[PDB]
Amino acid sequence: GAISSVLNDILSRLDPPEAEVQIDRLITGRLQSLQTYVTQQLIRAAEIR
Amino acid sequence: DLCFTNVYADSFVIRGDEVRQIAPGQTGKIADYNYKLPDDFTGCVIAWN
């Protein structure tokens, strides 16, 4: 949902208060990738165990 | 209906066309060089002709 996937593009192109929302979309989005990766690894940890 | 540790009233006068420059993280002549309002401004802004 951000204007760009790169952090520097948001901080450089957009203003600070506009970056607070756009950078948060990358944070909230990428945190789900970690939560999904960690969740799958714990699930695979049960299979390998 | 709430208490506060300290309340500071910054008193100054501006023109009518300059009222839009005073805001969180807003640019302008009186905003960027005289009084830049912080992004986490938890205070109040009052105006009167």
Vertex B37: Cα angle to B32 and B42 (nearest 5): 170
Cα four-point dihedral sign B29, B35, B39, B42 = negative
Which method was used?
A: cryo-EM
| Chain A contact set for B39 (CB, 8 A) | 16-17, 20
Measure the CA–CA gap between B23 and A1, rounded to whole angstroms. Answer: 26
Classify burial at B17, counting beta carbons within 10 Å of its beta carbon; exposed 0-12, middle 13-18, buried 19 or more: exposed
Task: Judge: A15–B25 Cβ closer than 8 Å, yes or no.
Answer: yes
Cα of B43 to nearest chain A Cα, Å: 17
Resolution in A: 4.3
Task: Judge: B39–A20 Cβ closer than 8 Å, yes or no.
Answer: yes
b/e per residue A5-39 (b: at least 16 CB within 10 A): eeeeebeeebeeeebeebbeebeeeeeeeeeeeee
The residue to which tokens 């948060």 are assigned: A24
Cα of A45 to nearest chain B Cα, Å: 43
